[PDB]
Amino acid sequence: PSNMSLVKETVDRLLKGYDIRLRPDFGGPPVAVGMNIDIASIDMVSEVNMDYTLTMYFQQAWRDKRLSYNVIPLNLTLDNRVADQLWVPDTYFLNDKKSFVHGVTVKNRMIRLHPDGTVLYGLRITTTAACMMDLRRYPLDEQNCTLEIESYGYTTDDIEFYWRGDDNAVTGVTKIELPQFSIVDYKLITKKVVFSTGSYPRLSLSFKLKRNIGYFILQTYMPSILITILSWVSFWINYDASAARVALGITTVLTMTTINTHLRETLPKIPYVKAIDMYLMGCFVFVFMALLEYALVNYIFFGTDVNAIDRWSRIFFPVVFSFFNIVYWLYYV
Template sequence: MTAPFKHTACLLRLALTGLLFVWWRPCEGNAPNKTVCVLYEASPNISCLLEGYDRNFRPNFGKEALVINMSMTVASIDSVSEVDLDYTITILLRQFWKDQRLAYRGMNRSLSLDGRLVEALWVPDTFLLNSKEAFLHKVTVDNRLIRLFSDGELIYGMRITSVLACKMDLRKYPLDEQTCTLELESYGYTKEDLIFTWKDGNKSIHNLDKIDLSQFSLGDHNTKTSESVYETGTYPRLILSFKLHRNVFFFLLQTYVPSILLVISSWVSFWINHEAVPARVALGITTVLTMTTFITSARASLPRISYIKAVDVYLVMCFVFVFAALLEYAFVNFESTTSKHRARKRLRARKNKNKKQEEIKHLDEAKPLKGPLKAAVMESTKTDDEPPTPTSPGIGSTTSSTRRRERQPTFFDVASNVVSNLREKRAAFKVEIKDINVIDKYSRVIFPLSFVLFNIFYWITYTF
């Protein structure tokens, strides 16, 4: 073999060896048999840890799924909105996992690293599934924590504020109890890659029972592990659920007590003289308009949902009671006007009767009337309320019957008779109220009693 050929073969062998070395270095950083980095208390150097480290691959890549343990501290629940069906929460989320590539020796204590170092490490792609919007706090620096232990265990903490959707059933509002959730899920890793678990079950949630809300009191909370199935695979999910008991005292002062007082105010008209028309009408209209305003303002603070809420039932029934009080006065006023009209009509009839009787008396004294003529005159003096006296057979009856036979009844005569019969039947069934004040007296008892019964039924139905 010539010298130039040997020289060329040697160069090719060196080049191939160099390529293999370059290709093998990244893989060596992820290999489980990587040399454990040695750190010294005096001057720890983390560059040794990151030598050959590839953040694009999860720990245990190609092997069993990596277990991610989680815990959470609830810093605050800022608001709960029934209009938007969501709530705002600030949490300190901590994730625990083990990355053997970051194991070290030489130091017995853990390393608290700068949060900016997270850009150089692999971290889980956890996100809030039911989040509408969220942000990571950055004052004065990014609120992130990285803590590394000698066996490669990592703690990754973040401070997050998020607006989370909450499915609410407002049928019993404001006597309701809501259950809201916080759901954590992996965005890109399926259950073959990651396993999500709560670190200590329900004890993984801290400080939730110490949260104070203006309109709610927090009840029991529960944690569970679940999975989400999509077209791209099955993803691990963690769920925190907690109950919100609404404090009804605020709504008692804002809605219920004013409505009750308004209904009671409408009953004042029952003690006002029915002849004081301006006072009773003004009171009735004012209470009706005020109740309408209450209903409008109550619905403005709630979403436009199709079903009826408990507060709607109460306000509508209060409106019915207030409107019924106004209708009661309309009925009283109508009966009062009608009774006065009937009284005037009777008075005129009596005056006419007395006048005719006086005229007959004077005529009888001047020239006595006899027979059928006297009977006809007496019949003309009777009022509408008195039944007609049957005429005795004679000249008058013969003449009238002859006239009826000669004149045939027309359509208008028949219609007039039908109308007269209907009026007579209506008058027979009509109950005349002699004392108008009786209506107000009964209303003073019926209205309060009905309202009390309604309240008993309402509070039993929606409270239990």
């Protein structure tokens, strides 16, 4: 038990006379607090609430001369309960709506006092960070969601942030597979935000999410375009069969309304028109225009040539709808 007893003496010496109230090297240069993150998972990107749920291993290494030890050659990994007895950066996520450290089996924290003094503090944090989502072109949209990391109290003179390993600081984002979002790219930034009090240190980890159109192309656009195609068929039915033609148009319009109401789920109420909203409106007003075209045809009937007007109406509708569709897609794609 000589080795373990000696290690106990060393740890007792380190925690002896250790003032948690003072940052490392108080009355001295800013302490460089490196950060590295391992994104365990990103899930439940709540467009309705404009936020995403992030689960990550949040390591943050910094130098500290007080905790330096030399007797033991190995890297002590003390119990996670010693974190409360040690100074840590007062880091806080600025755009965090609610966050918590995972509970079982014990509070998921890590402490690892290296011989030099470096401390590898780490946490397994789940945070529902919020990113203002610009859904103007949704679903054919991208989102620049981020996790602003900042020191609440200390200023740049007292603490400095930086990604440890630089572009290699953040890991595991590639493996993530969100259900409807492809993480096209992630970018790491270092800033010194100038507030009223002073220049605070800042880090920003932004994932440029991109919407997966496969589900939206499956359920949103395809049924709508099919229903719209049905409306043109009423032009083939001819005018003498008034009842069948008007029945067809009536079914089409009510189908469009049902589509709109059922698709409204899981959508916020941003004022501007969404791309899905624009396309649904376009198809719906086009179907209504088809019904109005039938009305015009019947009114002309009451007032040979009606068949010729029907002939022109035949070709115009697919062509004009195709032009409108191409305009929509090229504008948005």
